[PDB]
Each structure stands twice: as C-alpha cells, then as structure tokens.
C-alpha cells in the first residue's frame, strides 16, 4: 500500500499569498498517476489536477502541479478568497488507491486571544446523574490553544472532550467548547473545578474556577 | 452532460446489509473504471472500490474486503457496491466516482450504521453568572444530549437573535447517541431584561424543545 503524507497539515495564507501544498508517497508513484482535488464544505471533491501535471477542464491557471516518483507538489500561484478548502492528493496507478489525509488552506488573520467562559454542572444535568463542567473559549485566532482541567488543583486527563466551530465566515476566528465530564458521585467528592487556557493571544493562562455548590 | 446519481442510503444496523446504486449518464458508461470512495462525518476521503469497465476486475481497500462487493450492469449503465456485515466506522457520505483520477463525482448517500433507535433530544441550559461573564460581556448555551440520528437545529429566540450564536459539531457518544452544544455571547447588560430561549427541532424524531436560559448569581 502506497502511503501518501500531505504536508503541512493547515497552511494559514492571505488572498494574494502563493500557497505550497506537498505529498510525498512511501514508494514511487507508477507513470506520476497523481491526482490533486479541491474539496469545500458540503460539496463532493473536485479534479484539480490529473496525471502529476495537467489541469482538469474548466480548472484556473493559477493551479499548477508537478512533480514525480516520491515527491509531488500542488501550487496556487495568487489565492482567491475561493481557494480557501480542503485539497487532497491521490494516487491511481496502483491498488489500494489512497489518497493523502488532506492540507486546509485556512484564512490569516491578526492574534485573537479568546475570552473564557466556565459552566458549572445545572440542577436539571445533575439529576440526570451527570457532571458535566463546560469551559468555553470563544472567538479567538489562531487554532492553537491548550486547555487544562483542574479538579482541586490536580491536572486532570482523559475525562474531557473538546469541539471546535470552523473558522467564522465574517471574523476569521474560532470557538472551543471543552467538556469535563464526571459521575454525579465523582463530582461530589472535589470542591474547586478550574479550566486553565494557554494561548498565543494570551500574556500569561487564564483560570475559570468555581466551588462545588456556590 | 456526465450525471452520477447514488441511492440507497440510510440508516442501517451493525451486521446489516445495505446497496448503493449510481445510475450513470451522458458517456459511454462500459469505457471507464468506476469508483466508491467515502467520507466519515467531518474526516477525510477514503478509497472503498473500483471495478474496470467490463467488471472482469474488481479492487478493495483492506476495511472493506470480504465484506463489500462493487458491480456494474454496463446494459443499464448502473454501478452497484452490496454492503454486508456493516460495522459502525462504516458511517460516511459514499460517492460515485467516474474514472481514473476522478473528474465526475455524484453528490454522495448518507449511510448511517448504528445500533440506536431514532431519539429526540434531552436539552440542559448553560445559564450565565459571574463565571461566564468577560468585561460586559455574557456567554450562555444549552446542552443538547443523547438524540439520534443526525441533525438537531438550534436557534435562539425563534431565529431573532443571530449575531454571536456558535453551534459545535454534534459528537457522537459510546450510546450510539449525539450531543453538541449551542452558545451565544450577549451584553452583560441585558441579562434579566431580555429572554434567552434556545428552540431545539430534532425532525426524525418529530420533537422540538424550548429551554429558556436563566441567569444565576
Ligand atoms: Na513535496
Ligand atoms: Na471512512
Ligand atoms: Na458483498
Ligand atoms: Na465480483
Ligand atoms: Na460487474
């Protein structure tokens, strides 16, 4: 199987900007059967580029590919507010075919640290039997950003789930919901709940905290 | 004009069979390779199948083989991909794909492979405190739990309040079961003075929920 890395993971470019995308193969790519597709929220993926090099019918010339064997290399000389999507590299000449794991091209924008919100478990979620303790953090940019969970000030790991919003249409900038979740019995055995957020945008970490019952 | 049109999609059990079909137009159907490639809720594209133009060779990817089989009536210009023994990471949008290095592509079938019977939704309120508020700015939100399957719609205030509303992916729970949250950032200000309701519509269901959200101390 034919192990196809695309590098780097999220490119961050401006209109205007010329973006790089890599794929590299673990073998040699038979006849540079290499097919390069643009691919946007709620839409099937398209043809960009077939056979390492050519351009797909109805395709701007600003979409170049080249390369061969191991190395392949997507470039889109000037972006358009429209480039912005998800592109994948694949292989056909020899099965299985598989494609790369994908490279976002994301919109730049300025550092935007993000403002944080923590949610203690309601009335009505504790009755169900559940703690579930909230830390929001919201409209901020870049991506990056850590958050640890603190339950009595002992760091805390593998009892939280975190999601993410896409990158906002008018903004640029992202949201994170991370959730802690304890048994209702758990929750009960620990006083203070802290959410602790490192970011780029932020000087120092900042704690959301909160006393069991208060 | 090239037209890939799949069906057959839906919801399906684990160990149950589903068959996708894609009813091919506008080419010569018997002169290309077809494909099935799939995409799991908010992943990558996975190669699943090709068949060559006659169907005399047929290919798999290793998740798949044994299990799925990919053919083509060349007479009725139609490719077929029989899923038995479906397993829950089978869950993905599958598309029809035209040739080598895929320059057509159907608009894909949702199949959804789960134990869970169709639930609505629990909704608990993230009410707004001291703890939730950022210089004269609040943040509220209501949980929306345990429903099955995709999608709930989340507005608030009946669709009038817009600006600052953030709705996370749905994540799908060892229950077979999804849960997501809504949120919204307000002026400090307007708390107790304006009402905040989330308004939760869970269509496979037939059910819908208010919650009106509560300012604490
Ligand atoms: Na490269
Ligand atoms: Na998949
Ligand atoms: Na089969
Ligand atoms: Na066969
Ligand atoms: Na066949």
């Known amino acids: 199987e034919i192990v196809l890395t695309q590098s780097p993971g999220t490119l961050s470019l401006s209109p205007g900007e010329r973006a790089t995308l890599s794929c590299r193969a673990s073998?040699?790519?038979?006849?540079?059967?290499l097919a390069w597709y643009q691919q946007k929220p709620g839409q099937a993926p398209r043809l960009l580029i077939y056979?390492?090099?050519s351009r797909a019918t109805g395709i701007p010339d600003r979409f170049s590919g080249s390369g061969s064997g191991t190395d392949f290399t997507l470039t889109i000389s000037r972006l358009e507010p429209e480039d912005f999507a998800v592109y994948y590299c694949?292989?056909?000449?020899?099965?299985?075919?598989?494609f790369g794991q994908g490279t976002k091209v994301e919109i730049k924008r300025t550092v935007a640290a993000p403002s944080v919100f923590i949610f203690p478990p309601s009335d009505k979620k504790l009755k169900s039997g559940t703690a579930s303790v909230v830390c929001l953090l919201n409209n901020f940019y870049p991506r990056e950003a850590k958050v640890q969970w603190k339950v009595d000030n002992a760091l805390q790991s593998g009892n939280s789930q975190e999601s993410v919003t896409e990158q906002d249409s008018k903004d640029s900038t992202y949201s994170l919901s991370s959730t802690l979740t304890l048994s209702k019995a758990d929750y009960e055995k620990h006083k203070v709940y802290a959410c602790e957020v490192t970011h780029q945008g932020l000087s120092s970490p900042v704690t959301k905290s909160f006393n069991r019952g208060e | 004009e090239v037209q890939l049109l799949e069906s057959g999609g839906g919801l399906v059990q684990p160990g149950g069979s589903l068959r996708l079909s894609c009813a091919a137009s506008g080419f010569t159907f018997s002169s290309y390779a077809m494909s099935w490639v799939r995409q799991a809720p908010g992943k990558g594209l996975e190669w699943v199948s090709a068949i060559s133009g006659s169907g005399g060779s047929t290919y798999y990817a290793d998740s798949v083989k044994g299990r799925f089989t990919i053919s083509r009536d060349n007479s009725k210009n139609t490719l077929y991909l029989q899923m038995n023994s479906l397993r829950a990471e089978d869950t993905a949008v599958y598309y029809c794909?035209?040739?080598?290095?895929?320059?057509?592509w159907g608009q894909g079938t949702l199949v959804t492979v789960s134990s869970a019977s169709t639930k609505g939704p629990s909704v608990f309120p993230l009410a707004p405190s001291s703890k939730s508020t950022s210089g004269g700015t609040a943040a509220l939100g209501c949980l929306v739990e345990d429903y099955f399957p995709e999608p709930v719609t989340v507005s608030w205030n009946s669709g009038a309040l817009t600006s600052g509303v953030h709705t996370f992916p749905a994540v799908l729970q060892s229950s077979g079961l999804y849960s997501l949250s809504s949120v919204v950032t307000v002026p400090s200000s307007s708390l107790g003075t304006q009402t905040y309701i989330c308004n939760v519509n869970h269509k496979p269901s037939n059910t819908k929920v208010d919650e009106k959200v509560e300012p604490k101390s």
């Open positions: 794909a035209k040739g080598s290095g895929f320059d057509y």
């Open positions: 073998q040699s790519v038979s006849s540079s059967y």
């Open positions: 056979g390492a090099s």
């Open positions: 694949q292989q056909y000449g020899s099965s299985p075919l598989t």
